[PDB]
Amino acid sequence: MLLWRRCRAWLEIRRLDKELAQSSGLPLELPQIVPNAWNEVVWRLPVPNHPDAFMTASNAAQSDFIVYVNGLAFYRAWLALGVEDSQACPLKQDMPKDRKYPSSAAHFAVGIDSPVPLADVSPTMILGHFAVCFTDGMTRSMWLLAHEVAVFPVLSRDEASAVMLAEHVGVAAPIQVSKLREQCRKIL
Ligand code: AUC
């Protein structure tokens, strides 16, 4: 029921608040941009006690922006959507119960040969507070979070939205997809 879910979500957010407080200003494991047998931005993501995951900005528009997000912070902002929204975030413990989760785990298993495209997310406002919502990529985000990936990239529609995401959940300034692609080519 509803009070049940609200109280659960409240307690998880409080947990996240503490964790973020403890780990404030400590170094996190970053995605690693890798050289690739294609013409795309690809990252190696370390996954604790698990084989590496690989993701790609292949399905991004040149106009999109990349934001590298603190997983815990991203998770907390997702919970801010509340519990009734169709995009409501399951508690981490229940994420593997999600219907598409096995299909996502399957995709993440392939590796560098078929990297998983990024999620497309947006900053929004819910009952007067900041939250994150999705255009796509909720399940793969759950996989990442349930597997405790510390930092991962996400896609945002435009500069201001990406700056807003980075402000609340980012570990770095946003960078435009077109400009990152260019730099990857000039360096990697
Ligand atoms: N391609 C592709 Au996929 C998830 N989760």
Q: Is 141 a pocket residue for ligand 1 (Cβ < 6 Å)? A: no
Q: Is 139 a pocket residue for ligand 1 (Cβ < 6 Å)? A: yes
Best probe residue, ligand 1, of 101, 107, 136 (max atoms within 8 Å of C-beta): 107
Please give the distance, rounded to the nearest whole angstrom, from the Cα atom of residue 104 to the centre of ligand 1: 6
Q: Is 92 a pocket residue for ligand 1 (Cβ < 6 Å)? A: no
Distance of CA 108 to the CA centre of its chain: 14
Q: Give, to the nearest 10 degrees, the angle between helix 71-79 and helix 2-22.
A: 150
Delimit the domains of the chain by residue range: 1-188
| Minimal-distance CA residue to ligand 1 atom 1 | 116
Q: Scanning the structure block, which residue is given the tokens 């096995």?
A: 102
Record the resolution, in angstroms: 2.0
The DSSP bridge pattern shows strands 116-117 and 53-56 to be: parallel
Distance of CA 104 to the CA centre of its chain: 14
Q: Are 126 and 82 in contact (CB under 8 A)?
A: yes
